Amino acid sequence: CDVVIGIINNTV
Amino acid sequence: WTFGAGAALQIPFAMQMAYRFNGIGVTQNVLYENQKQIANQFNKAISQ
Known part of the structure:
Protein backbone atom coordinates (compact mmCIF):
# COMPACT_ATOMS: atom_id res chain seq x y z
CA CYS A 1 0.00 0.00 0.00
CA ASP A 2 2.30 2.72 -1.25
CA VAL A 3 1.03 5.30 -3.76
CA VAL A 4 -2.56 4.62 -2.85
CA ILE A 5 -5.46 6.98 -3.17
CA GLY A 6 -7.95 4.05 -3.07
CA ILE A 7 -9.97 4.01 0.12
CA ILE A 8 -11.43 0.56 -0.27
CA ASN A 9 -11.44 -1.72 2.76
CA ASN A 10 -14.03 -4.48 3.52
CA THR A 11 -12.70 -6.27 0.49
CA VAL A 12 -14.06 -9.63 -0.68
CA TRP B 1 -10.14 6.63 -25.09
CA THR B 2 -13.58 7.28 -26.41
CA PHE B 3 -12.24 10.10 -28.50
CA GLY B 4 -12.48 10.13 -32.24
CA ALA B 5 -15.29 7.63 -32.19
CA GLY B 6 -17.15 9.51 -29.51
CA ALA B 7 -17.15 12.89 -27.90
CA ALA B 8 -15.30 12.67 -24.56
CA LEU B 9 -15.02 11.00 -21.15
CA GLN B 10 -13.02 13.53 -18.98
CA ILE B 11 -10.42 11.16 -17.56
CA PRO B 12 -7.37 12.41 -15.56
CA PHE B 13 -4.91 10.63 -17.84
CA ALA B 14 -2.88 8.73 -15.39
CA MET B 15 -5.90 6.48 -15.64
CA GLN B 16 -5.80 6.81 -19.41
CA MET B 17 -2.19 5.89 -19.49
CA ALA B 18 -2.85 3.05 -17.10
CA TYR B 19 -5.13 1.72 -19.77
CA ARG B 20 -2.30 2.61 -22.15
CA PHE B 21 -0.15 0.28 -20.07
CA ASN B 22 -2.50 -2.53 -20.89
CA TYR B 32 1.92 4.67 -9.19
CA GLU B 33 4.92 3.08 -7.62
CA SER B 47 13.44 18.39 -22.80
CA GLN B 48 15.08 15.98 -25.18
Whole structure:
Protein backbone atom coordinates (compact mmCIF):
# COMPACT_ATOMS: atom_id res chain seq x y z
CA CYS A 1 0.00 0.00 0.00
CA ASP A 2 2.30 2.72 -1.25
CA VAL A 3 1.03 5.30 -3.76
CA VAL A 4 -2.56 4.62 -2.85
CA ILE A 5 -5.46 6.98 -3.17
CA GLY A 6 -7.95 4.05 -3.07
CA ILE A 7 -9.97 4.01 0.12
CA ILE A 8 -11.43 0.56 -0.27
CA ASN A 9 -11.44 -1.72 2.76
CA ASN A 10 -14.03 -4.48 3.52
CA THR A 11 -12.70 -6.27 0.49
CA VAL A 12 -14.06 -9.63 -0.68
CA TRP B 1 -10.14 6.63 -25.09
CA THR B 2 -13.58 7.28 -26.41
CA PHE B 3 -12.24 10.10 -28.50
CA GLY B 4 -12.48 10.13 -32.24
CA ALA B 5 -15.29 7.63 -32.19
CA GLY B 6 -17.15 9.51 -29.51
CA ALA B 7 -17.15 12.89 -27.90
CA ALA B 8 -15.30 12.67 -24.56
CA LEU B 9 -15.02 11.00 -21.15
CA GLN B 10 -13.02 13.53 -18.98
CA ILE B 11 -10.42 11.16 -17.56
CA PRO B 12 -7.37 12.41 -15.56
CA PHE B 13 -4.91 10.63 -17.84
CA ALA B 14 -2.88 8.73 -15.39
CA MET B 15 -5.90 6.48 -15.64
CA GLN B 16 -5.80 6.81 -19.41
CA MET B 17 -2.19 5.89 -19.49
CA ALA B 18 -2.85 3.05 -17.10
CA TYR B 19 -5.13 1.72 -19.77
CA ARG B 20 -2.30 2.61 -22.15
CA PHE B 21 -0.15 0.28 -20.07
CA ASN B 22 -2.50 -2.53 -20.89
CA GLY B 23 -2.89 -2.16 -24.65
CA ILE B 24 0.86 -2.21 -24.68
CA GLY B 25 0.34 -5.08 -22.31
CA VAL B 26 2.15 -4.26 -19.11
CA THR B 27 1.15 -3.85 -15.51
CA GLN B 28 -0.28 -1.07 -13.44
CA ASN B 29 2.23 -1.72 -10.67
CA VAL B 30 4.97 0.30 -12.31
CA LEU B 31 2.72 3.33 -12.60
CA TYR B 32 1.92 4.67 -9.19
CA GLU B 33 4.92 3.08 -7.62
CA ASN B 34 6.84 4.97 -10.31
CA GLN B 35 4.68 8.09 -10.20
CA LYS B 36 7.36 10.73 -10.17
CA GLN B 37 9.76 8.27 -11.81
CA ILE B 38 7.87 7.83 -15.08
CA ALA B 39 6.61 11.41 -14.89
CA ASN B 40 10.03 12.93 -14.83
CA GLN B 41 11.41 10.34 -17.19
CA PHE B 42 8.84 11.65 -19.60
CA ASN B 43 9.80 15.17 -18.67
CA LYS B 44 13.39 14.41 -19.55
CA ALA B 45 12.05 13.06 -22.80
CA ILE B 46 10.25 16.41 -23.20
CA SER B 47 13.44 18.39 -22.80
CA GLN B 48 15.08 15.98 -25.18
